[PDB]
Design a protein around this ligand. Sequence first.
Ligand code: HEC
Length: 250
Amino acid sequence: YPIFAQQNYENPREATGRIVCANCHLASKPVDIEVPQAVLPDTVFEAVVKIPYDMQLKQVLANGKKGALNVGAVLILPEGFELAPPDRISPEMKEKIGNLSFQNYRPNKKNILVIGPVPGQKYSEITFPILAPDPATNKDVHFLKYPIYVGGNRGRGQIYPDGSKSNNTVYNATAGGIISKILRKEKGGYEITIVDASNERQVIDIIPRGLELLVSEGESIKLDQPLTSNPNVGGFGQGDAEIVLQDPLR
Ligand code: HEC
Protein backbone atom coordinates (compact mmCIF):
# COMPACT_ATOMS: atom_id res chain seq x y z
CA TYR A 1 0.00 0.00 0.00
CA PRO A 2 1.32 3.61 -0.46
CA ILE A 3 1.08 3.88 3.36
CA PHE A 4 3.57 1.02 4.00
CA ALA A 5 6.30 2.85 2.04
CA GLN A 6 5.47 6.19 3.65
CA GLN A 7 5.46 4.68 7.17
CA ASN A 8 8.97 3.30 6.77
CA TYR A 9 11.06 4.63 3.93
CA GLU A 10 11.79 8.36 4.35
CA ASN A 11 12.44 8.95 0.66
CA PRO A 12 10.74 6.62 -1.96
CA ARG A 13 13.53 6.34 -4.49
CA GLU A 14 16.56 4.34 -3.50
CA ALA A 15 20.16 4.95 -4.70
CA THR A 16 19.78 2.26 -7.42
CA GLY A 17 16.89 4.28 -8.78
CA ARG A 18 14.32 1.69 -7.68
CA ILE A 19 11.20 2.89 -5.98
CA VAL A 20 10.55 1.19 -2.68
CA CYS A 21 7.22 -0.47 -3.71
CA ALA A 22 9.38 -2.99 -5.59
CA ASN A 23 10.51 -4.39 -2.21
CA CYS A 24 7.16 -6.03 -1.61
CA HIS A 25 5.50 -5.66 -5.06
CA LEU A 26 7.62 -8.21 -6.82
CA ALA A 27 6.31 -8.72 -10.37
CA SER A 28 7.35 -6.16 -12.98
CA LYS A 29 4.55 -4.67 -15.19
CA PRO A 30 4.70 -1.54 -17.46
CA VAL A 31 3.85 2.00 -16.27
CA ASP A 32 3.56 5.04 -18.52
CA ILE A 33 3.56 8.80 -17.94
CA GLU A 34 2.65 11.65 -20.31
CA VAL A 35 3.70 15.13 -19.18
CA PRO A 36 3.79 18.36 -21.38
CA GLN A 37 7.19 18.99 -23.01
CA ALA A 38 7.50 22.41 -21.33
CA VAL A 39 5.44 24.53 -18.88
CA LEU A 40 5.41 28.16 -17.82
CA PRO A 41 5.96 29.54 -14.26
CA ASP A 42 2.92 29.29 -11.91
CA THR A 43 0.65 27.35 -14.35
CA VAL A 44 -1.18 24.12 -13.66
CA PHE A 45 -0.44 21.13 -15.89
CA GLU A 46 -1.43 17.50 -15.70
CA ALA A 47 0.81 14.47 -15.35
CA VAL A 48 -1.07 11.40 -16.49
CA VAL A 49 0.16 8.06 -15.26
CA LYS A 50 -1.00 4.81 -16.94
CA ILE A 51 -0.92 1.59 -15.01
CA PRO A 52 -2.29 -0.86 -17.64
CA TYR A 53 -3.39 -4.46 -17.16
CA ASP A 54 -5.79 -7.00 -18.71
CA MET A 55 -9.00 -6.40 -16.95
CA GLN A 56 -10.42 -9.87 -17.00
CA LEU A 57 -7.75 -10.78 -14.44
CA LYS A 58 -8.75 -11.84 -10.99
CA GLN A 59 -6.32 -11.92 -8.15
CA VAL A 60 -6.42 -13.80 -4.84
CA LEU A 61 -7.90 -11.52 -2.26
CA ALA A 62 -6.74 -11.65 1.35
CA ASN A 63 -9.34 -14.33 2.33
CA GLY A 64 -8.85 -16.82 -0.52
CA LYS A 65 -11.65 -15.50 -2.77
CA LYS A 66 -10.74 -14.08 -6.20
CA GLY A 67 -11.42 -10.41 -7.12
CA ALA A 68 -10.43 -7.29 -9.01
CA LEU A 69 -7.26 -5.28 -8.73
CA ASN A 70 -6.56 -1.89 -7.18
CA VAL A 71 -4.06 0.61 -8.36
CA GLY A 72 -1.82 3.12 -6.58
CA ALA A 73 1.13 5.36 -7.56
CA VAL A 74 3.91 7.59 -6.21
CA LEU A 75 4.94 10.65 -8.25
CA ILE A 76 8.34 12.20 -7.47
CA LEU A 77 8.51 15.79 -8.70
CA PRO A 78 11.40 18.35 -8.50
CA GLU A 79 11.49 20.55 -5.41
CA GLY A 80 9.17 23.53 -5.87
CA PHE A 81 6.52 21.61 -7.83
CA GLU A 82 3.48 20.65 -5.75
CA LEU A 83 -0.18 19.58 -5.97
CA ALA A 84 -2.28 22.30 -7.64
CA PRO A 85 -4.68 24.02 -5.21
CA PRO A 86 -8.48 23.54 -5.69
CA ASP A 87 -9.06 27.15 -6.87
CA ARG A 88 -6.51 26.73 -9.63
CA ILE A 89 -8.08 23.50 -10.91
CA SER A 90 -10.25 23.89 -13.95
CA PRO A 91 -13.77 22.31 -14.10
CA GLU A 92 -12.77 20.37 -17.27
CA MET A 93 -9.91 19.00 -15.12
CA LYS A 94 -11.88 18.42 -11.93
CA GLU A 95 -14.11 15.81 -13.69
CA LYS A 96 -10.94 14.19 -15.07
CA ILE A 97 -9.41 13.74 -11.58
CA GLY A 98 -12.68 12.00 -10.45
CA ASN A 99 -12.55 12.48 -6.67
CA LEU A 100 -9.11 11.22 -5.80
CA SER A 101 -7.24 12.47 -2.75
CA PHE A 102 -3.56 12.87 -3.51
CA GLN A 103 -1.55 12.89 -0.27
CA ASN A 104 1.99 14.13 0.27
CA TYR A 105 4.47 11.34 0.93
CA ARG A 106 5.33 13.08 4.24
CA PRO A 107 4.14 16.68 5.22
CA ASN A 108 7.60 18.14 4.45
CA LYS A 109 7.88 16.45 1.03
CA LYS A 110 5.35 18.56 -0.89
CA ASN A 111 6.91 17.31 -4.14
CA ILE A 112 6.18 13.57 -3.74
CA LEU A 113 2.53 12.64 -4.11
CA VAL A 114 0.88 9.26 -3.44
CA ILE A 115 -2.57 8.03 -4.32
CA GLY A 116 -4.24 4.66 -3.82
CA PRO A 117 -5.48 2.07 -3.24
CA VAL A 118 -8.17 3.09 -5.81
CA PRO A 119 -10.11 0.65 -7.99
CA GLY A 120 -8.36 -0.43 -11.15
CA GLN A 121 -11.54 -0.54 -13.41
CA LYS A 122 -11.92 3.17 -12.82
CA TYR A 123 -8.40 4.48 -12.37
CA SER A 124 -5.96 2.73 -14.66
CA GLU A 125 -4.94 6.25 -15.81
CA ILE A 126 -4.69 8.90 -13.17
CA THR A 127 -4.28 12.64 -13.69
CA PHE A 128 -2.17 14.47 -11.11
CA PRO A 129 -2.75 18.30 -11.22
CA ILE A 130 0.69 19.86 -10.65
CA LEU A 131 1.47 23.59 -10.14
CA ALA A 132 4.74 24.67 -11.80
CA PRO A 133 6.93 26.95 -9.54
CA ASP A 134 8.08 30.43 -10.34
CA PRO A 135 11.82 31.29 -10.29
CA ALA A 136 11.08 34.98 -9.59
CA THR A 137 9.45 33.81 -6.37
CA ASN A 138 11.79 30.89 -5.41
CA LYS A 139 15.57 31.28 -5.56
CA ASP A 140 16.43 27.57 -5.94
CA VAL A 141 14.02 26.90 -8.81
CA HIS A 142 15.46 27.69 -12.25
CA PHE A 143 14.34 27.49 -15.85
CA LEU A 144 15.91 24.08 -16.52
CA LYS A 145 14.99 20.57 -17.59
CA TYR A 146 13.74 18.60 -14.59
CA PRO A 147 13.34 14.82 -14.00
CA ILE A 148 9.95 13.35 -12.96
CA TYR A 149 9.76 9.73 -11.62
CA VAL A 150 6.66 7.61 -11.22
CA GLY A 151 6.02 4.23 -9.65
CA GLY A 152 2.71 2.45 -10.48
CA ASN A 153 1.28 -0.69 -8.96
CA ARG A 154 -1.80 -2.85 -9.64
CA GLY A 155 -2.54 -5.91 -7.42
CA ARG A 156 -1.77 -7.13 -3.89
CA GLY A 157 1.88 -7.38 -2.84
CA GLN A 158 3.80 -10.39 -1.76
CA ILE A 159 5.57 -9.37 1.48
CA TYR A 160 4.14 -7.38 4.41
CA PRO A 161 6.08 -4.76 6.52
CA ASP A 162 7.22 -7.42 9.03
CA GLY A 163 8.70 -9.75 6.36
CA SER A 164 5.71 -12.14 6.28
CA LYS A 165 4.61 -13.45 2.93
CA SER A 166 0.99 -12.89 1.97
CA ASN A 167 -1.08 -15.59 0.18
CA ASN A 168 -0.39 -13.85 -3.15
CA THR A 169 2.96 -15.47 -3.76
CA VAL A 170 4.50 -18.89 -4.36
CA TYR A 171 4.90 -21.19 -1.37
CA ASN A 172 8.21 -23.08 -1.40
CA ALA A 173 9.15 -26.32 0.40
CA THR A 174 11.18 -25.62 3.50
CA ALA A 175 12.85 -29.08 3.19
CA GLY A 176 13.78 -31.53 0.44
CA GLY A 177 12.32 -35.05 0.77
CA ILE A 178 9.31 -37.04 -0.25
CA ILE A 179 5.81 -35.80 0.60
CA SER A 180 4.35 -38.43 2.86
CA LYS A 181 0.90 -36.74 3.40
CA ILE A 182 -1.21 -33.77 2.13
CA LEU A 183 -4.05 -32.85 4.49
CA ARG A 184 -6.59 -30.74 2.62
CA LYS A 185 -8.08 -28.45 5.25
CA GLU A 186 -11.76 -28.02 6.13
CA LYS A 187 -12.08 -24.35 5.38
CA GLY A 188 -9.36 -24.30 2.67
CA GLY A 189 -5.59 -24.53 2.70
CA TYR A 190 -3.23 -27.50 3.13
CA GLU A 191 -0.84 -29.10 5.51
CA ILE A 192 2.01 -30.88 3.68
CA THR A 193 4.25 -33.38 5.51
CA ILE A 194 7.77 -33.82 4.06
CA VAL A 195 10.01 -36.62 5.28
CA ASP A 196 13.50 -35.39 4.63
CA ALA A 197 14.92 -38.87 4.40
CA SER A 198 18.41 -37.41 4.09
CA ASN A 199 18.27 -35.61 7.46
CA GLU A 200 15.83 -38.07 9.10
CA ARG A 201 13.64 -35.07 9.78
CA GLN A 202 9.92 -34.54 9.34
CA VAL A 203 8.65 -30.98 8.48
CA ILE A 204 5.09 -29.68 7.86
CA ASP A 205 4.65 -26.82 5.41
CA ILE A 206 1.32 -25.03 5.66
CA ILE A 207 -0.28 -23.57 2.59
CA PRO A 208 -3.00 -20.88 2.70
CA ARG A 209 -6.32 -20.83 0.84
CA GLY A 210 -6.62 -19.40 -2.69
CA LEU A 211 -3.62 -21.43 -3.80
CA GLU A 212 -3.48 -24.68 -5.63
CA LEU A 213 -0.86 -27.27 -5.15
CA LEU A 214 1.54 -28.47 -7.79
CA VAL A 215 2.52 -31.60 -5.81
CA SER A 216 1.24 -35.11 -5.10
CA GLU A 217 1.74 -37.49 -2.16
CA GLY A 218 4.74 -39.70 -2.84
CA GLU A 219 6.57 -37.01 -4.85
CA SER A 220 10.16 -36.05 -4.23
CA ILE A 221 10.50 -32.33 -3.60
CA LYS A 222 13.83 -30.37 -3.39
CA LEU A 223 14.45 -27.54 -0.84
CA ASP A 224 12.72 -24.32 -2.09
CA GLN A 225 10.89 -26.23 -4.78
CA PRO A 226 7.61 -24.39 -5.49
CA LEU A 227 4.77 -26.36 -3.93
CA THR A 228 1.95 -24.15 -5.38
CA SER A 229 1.13 -22.11 -8.52
CA ASN A 230 2.21 -18.45 -8.56
CA PRO A 231 -1.18 -16.67 -7.97
CA ASN A 232 0.12 -13.15 -8.69
CA VAL A 233 -1.49 -11.41 -11.66
CA GLY A 234 -0.33 -7.88 -10.77
CA GLY A 235 2.94 -5.95 -10.79
CA PHE A 236 4.86 -2.72 -10.24
CA GLY A 237 6.66 -0.69 -12.85
CA GLN A 238 8.39 2.65 -12.96
CA GLY A 239 9.04 5.30 -15.57
CA ASP A 240 10.39 8.81 -15.98
CA ALA A 241 9.84 12.00 -17.86
CA GLU A 242 11.71 15.27 -18.24
CA ILE A 243 9.90 18.62 -18.18
CA VAL A 244 11.24 22.00 -19.25
CA LEU A 245 10.33 24.88 -16.88
CA GLN A 246 10.24 27.58 -19.50
CA ASP A 247 11.17 31.26 -19.41
CA PRO A 248 8.10 33.21 -20.65
CA LEU A 249 10.46 35.25 -22.91
CA ARG A 250 13.33 33.50 -24.92
C1 HEC B 1 5.84 -3.80 1.63
C2 HEC B 1 6.20 -3.32 3.00
C3 HEC B 1 5.12 -2.97 0.76
C4 HEC B 1 5.44 -1.72 0.32
C5 HEC B 1 6.69 -0.89 0.66
C6 HEC B 1 4.35 -1.29 -0.56
N1 HEC B 1 3.33 -2.22 -0.63
FE1 HEC B 1 1.61 -2.09 -1.58
N2 HEC B 1 1.00 -3.75 -0.75
C7 HEC B 1 1.74 -4.64 -0.01
C8 HEC B 1 0.95 -5.78 0.42
C9 HEC B 1 1.41 -7.03 1.19
C10 HEC B 1 -0.29 -5.54 -0.03
C11 HEC B 1 -1.48 -6.45 0.17
C12 HEC B 1 -2.32 -6.11 1.36
C13 HEC B 1 -3.46 -7.09 1.42
O1 HEC B 1 -3.48 -7.96 2.28
O2 HEC B 1 -4.29 -7.09 0.53
C14 HEC B 1 -0.26 -4.31 -0.77
C15 HEC B 1 -1.31 -3.80 -1.52
C16 HEC B 1 -1.24 -2.67 -2.32
C17 HEC B 1 -2.32 -2.17 -3.15
C18 HEC B 1 -3.74 -2.70 -3.21
C19 HEC B 1 -3.85 -3.91 -4.14
C20 HEC B 1 -5.23 -4.48 -4.39
O3 HEC B 1 -6.10 -4.40 -3.53
O4 HEC B 1 -5.46 -4.99 -5.48
C21 HEC B 1 -1.81 -1.16 -3.85
C22 HEC B 1 -2.56 -0.33 -4.86
C23 HEC B 1 -0.44 -1.02 -3.45
N3 HEC B 1 -0.09 -1.92 -2.49
C24 HEC B 1 0.43 -0.07 -3.96
C25 HEC B 1 1.71 0.19 -3.51
C26 HEC B 1 2.57 1.30 -3.99
C27 HEC B 1 2.33 2.17 -5.22
C28 HEC B 1 3.63 1.30 -3.18
C29 HEC B 1 4.73 2.08 -3.26
C30 HEC B 1 4.65 3.53 -2.78
C31 HEC B 1 3.45 0.22 -2.24
N4 HEC B 1 2.28 -0.48 -2.47
C32 HEC B 1 4.39 -0.14 -1.32
C33 HEC B 1 3.03 -4.40 0.41
C34 HEC B 1 3.79 -3.26 0.15
